[PDB]
């Protein structure tokens, strides 16, 4: 294929578009880029390990990868205390070396390997219009994805377990012996409203549900992989979809935008797959923690926190949710759907329980609430912690803030890319992506509007 | 041929005075619903307890507001992020008191504007155009989504969505600055560059085209009549415009390719607005503007003020007064 | 509300007079 504008029709700034029909070069680009991803995983892990002070919390040190490893149950014990630093190092080293291998392969295919693969092999050669081959590649990758989900399941069940922040006796790494395979729970998660108090799938709150849903995901992905290997797209799919490389790219871009938004919300709200031990409190958690901290302090001072009415007439410390549940008062009324391992022991069937509040509060809960209140996910861009009017002496931005902001931004720009490529794929399939033909300008053959 | 096929040809018809299309089949109902509810509420909605402290705020004209002060008030802080449709209220009066109209209008409006963007793509496809006008429109859509949905989601309440009113908009902005220092956020600076530069480039482009108009009229009639709709020839001399501009600054800073020029005109404000929309969307997660409070110390250790410290003083002044009865505890975390 | 007692006359004329100016000019156009 050509490597300039005259021979390709694409400028340098759209040079990767020149690869659309060079399957070998495209494969090289993909493999090298995968090498970039794995390289970042390894290098960032080693950086985080090197810059890790293991007696300080992870979320106080700007770490986003080490929490992922800790959640999987590696190198941590009860309450998230880092037992062994070596497994983090091993994850990083393995990713770095494998990235070397992937980069070598991507360079080979991009620079010297065969330009196209179709006259080399039918198995690896593909045509974008070859619907059966495209569904074959879908099938292979679906099988792989289901296998990866089952790898998560195997780690949680047979290889030491995963970190369970809801464990009795304290959050700890525990082995999940009874995943919920019950499809009612698993698929009723997908039907929950994406609004406050329901939290469509962000509300999954126990590792049994997570592991069981991953068993279901693995089975679904593998069976769909086989289904796509053994069939071709049906008539309705053929009549509804654009069948081109750019169209498939646009479809994947839409999917990725959806996943990016979901991940940003997930890290912002969920404290089960993102234990606060490693990611710090959620904003909801920190607000509730402040309310709890001052309930505890004022109660020790002698305030009768059940009957103390605030300035507006609502309870200063306790109040009712619009459905009647007893909740913390103040602005944190909006966060009454929050559930956390440190707060549920004080919750009764009706909400917060006066008897537990008056005699069941443990010193570790007070310490945890103070920590979470002071590590609220508020911070400046230059990493000054606290409310924006605070002064420069607290260097902290929550990992939840970093992850949520970054992935909302990436989700948005991938929605933009999906719009761009979907529109372009449609126009190119219909053949007017290069502009209006003067001879057959469609609007010239149309009746005037009025 | 078939009834469904006939309906399809009608909806996707390019001969309709207003294109409907499949995105239009969602846009029209949702936008009409939002408009009717907005007008009704703006005129006649009763006061809304936005802060969830039984402190209702009058937003409608009939309850003492003018056009500037009137608004559709965001739903109650007690609701938070809960879905509050009409059928979850004990009565219409309860729904009104808790700010249900805001949720109805906002949700329908958001669906409508996303469908408007899809409809722009659809009509471009039906007319044989290039497909990317909707990409430009995605910038205002991103900004509106940031202020009506994303920011309330990150903050955890639709009470922290932008009110549907003029003064409500100003209140939103002032509180936002107090809590996030949006002025000192580089994405908002990029938004300001986007709009200032977009207006600048609009003024230059319009003035350079108007300046280089080919003489086709007399001094009496409007020069606008020198252009005939659908004429093939060019109505201005782009070469003269390039000569003027390349001598105003220097030759190589002036576009002589109209296509590159118009791409630049499209791209600058759109990119700026994308950046500012992302700025609001990320300040939704309290990743705030720069904090240089007490960044400059003298040798002894006393703080030397900068303009950032004066700005922080203004922010604190806004911060301590806003929602004066809503806070019970020392830190404004919610 | 105790509003300015000249508000109604001011607003109505503010709209009305330019409105009739435009109406006159438009309707006579083509004479």
């Amino acid at each position: 294929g050509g490597r300039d504008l005259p021979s390709t029709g694409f400028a340098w700034w759209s040079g990767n578009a020149r690869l659309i029909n060079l399957s070998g070069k495209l494969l090289g680009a993909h493999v090298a880029h995968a090498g970039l991803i794995v390289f970042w995983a390894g290098a960032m892990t080693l950086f985080e390990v090197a810059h890790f002070i293991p007696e300080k919390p992870m979320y106080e040190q700007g770490l986003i990868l080490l929490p992922h490893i800790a959640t999987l149950g590696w190198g941590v014990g009860p309450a998230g205390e880092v037992t062994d630093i070596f497994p983090f190092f091993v994850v990083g080293v393995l990713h770095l070396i494998s990235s070397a291998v992937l980069g070598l392969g991507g360079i080979y295919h991009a620079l010297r390997g065969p330009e196209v693969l179709e006259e080399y092999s039918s198995f690896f050669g593909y045509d974008w219009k070859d619907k059966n081959q495209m569904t074959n590649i879908i099938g292979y990758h679906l099988i792989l994805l289901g296998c990866g989900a089952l790898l998560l399941v195997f780690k949680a069940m047979f290889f030491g377990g995963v970190y369970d922040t809801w464990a009795p006796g304290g959050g700890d790494v525990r082995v999940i012996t009874n995943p919920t395979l019950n499809p009612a729970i698993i698929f009723g998660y997908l039907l929950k409203a994406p609004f406050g108090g329901e939290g469509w799938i962000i509300s999954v709150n126990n590792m049994e549900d997570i592991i069981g849903g991953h068993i279901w995901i693995g089975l679904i992905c593998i069976s769909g992989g086989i289904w796509h290997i053994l069939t071709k797209p049906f008539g309705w799919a053929r009549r509804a979809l654009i069948w081109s490389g750019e169209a498939y790219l646009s479809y994947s871009l839409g999917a990725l935008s959806l996943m990016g938004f979901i991940a940003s919300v997930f890290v912002w709200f969920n404290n089960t797959a993102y234990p606060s031990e490693f990611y710090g409190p959620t904003g909801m958690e920190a607000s509730q923690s402040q309310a709890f901290t001052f309930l505890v302090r004022d109660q020790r001072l002698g305030a009768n926190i059940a009957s103390a009415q605030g300035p507006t007439g609502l309870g200063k410390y306790l109040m009712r949710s619009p459905s009647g549940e007893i909740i913390f008062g103040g602005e944190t009324m909006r966060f009454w759907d929050f559930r956390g391992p440190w707060l549920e022991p004080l919750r009764g069937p009706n909400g917060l329980d006066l008897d537990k509040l008056r005699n069941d509060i443990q010193p570790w809960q007070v310490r945890r609430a103070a920590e979470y209140m002071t590590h609220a996910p508020l911070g400046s861009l230059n990493s000054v912690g606290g409310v924006i009017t605070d002064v420069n002496s607290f260097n902290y931005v929550s990992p939840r803030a970093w992850l949520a902001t970054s992935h909302f931004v990436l989700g948005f720009f991938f929605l933009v890319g999906h719009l761009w490529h979907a529109g372009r794929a449609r126009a190119a399939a219909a053949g007017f992506e290069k502009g209006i033909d003067r001879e057959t300008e469609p609007t010239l053959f149309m009746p005037d509007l009025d | 041929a078939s009834l469904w096929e006939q309906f399809c040809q009608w909806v996707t018809s390019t001969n309709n005075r207003i294109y409907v299309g499949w995105f239009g089949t969602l846009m029209i109902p949702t936008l009409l619903t939002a408009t009717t509810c907005f007008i009704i509420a703006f005129i006649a909605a009763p006061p809304v307890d936005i802060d969830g402290i039984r402190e209702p705020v009058a937003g409608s004209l009939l309850y003492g507001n003018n056009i500037i002060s009137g608004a559709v008030v965001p739903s109650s802080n007690a609701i938070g992020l809960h879905f509050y449709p009409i059928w979850e209220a004990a009565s219409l009066d309860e729904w009104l008191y808790n700010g249900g109209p805001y949720q109805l209008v906002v949700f329908h409006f958001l669906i409508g504007i996303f469908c408007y963007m899809g409809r722009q793509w659809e009509l471009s496809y039906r007319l044989g155009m290039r497909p990317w006008i909707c990409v430009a429109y995605s910038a205002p859509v991103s900004a509106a989504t940031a202020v009506f949905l994303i920011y309330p989601i990150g903050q955890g309440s639709f009470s922290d969505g932008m009110p549907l009113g003029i003064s409500g908009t100003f209140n939103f902005m002032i509180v936002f600055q107090a809590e996030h220092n949006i002025l000192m956020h580089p994405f908002h600076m990029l938004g300001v560059a986007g709009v200032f530069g977009g207006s600048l480039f609009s003024a230059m482009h319009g003035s350079l085209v108007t300046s280089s108009l080919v003489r086709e009229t007399t001094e009496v009639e409007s020069q606008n009549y020198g252009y005939k709709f659908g004429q093939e020839e060019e109505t201005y001399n782009i070469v003269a415009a390039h000569g003027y501009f390349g001598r105003l600054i220097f030759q190589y800073a002036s576009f002589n390719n109209s296509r590159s020029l118009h791409f630049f005109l499209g791209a600058w404000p759109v990119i700026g607005i994308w950046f500012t929309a992302m700025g609001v969307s990320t300040m939704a997660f309290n990743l705030n503007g720069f904090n240089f409070n007490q960044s400059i110390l003298d040798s002894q250790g006393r703080v030397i003020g900068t303009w950032a410290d004066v700005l922080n003083r203004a922010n604190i002044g806004f911060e301590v007064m806003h929602e004066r009865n809503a806070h019970n505890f020392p830190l404004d975390l919610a | 509300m105790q509003v300015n007692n000249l508000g109604f006359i001011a607003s109505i004329l503010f709209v009305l007079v330019p409105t009739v100016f435009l109406l006159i000019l438009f309707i006579q156009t083509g004479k």
Partner: peptide, 30 residues
């Protein structure tokens, strides 16, 4: 009664919109 004035001006703007769309001067190619 200033509500009447506000409603009046808003309705004037909306009526202008409907007439400007429905009864616009048709663009004609000539």
């Amino acid at each position: 009664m200033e509500s009447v004035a506000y409603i009046l001006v808003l309705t004037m703007a909306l009526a202008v919109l409907f007439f400007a769309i429905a009864f616009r001067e048709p663009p004609r190619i000539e």
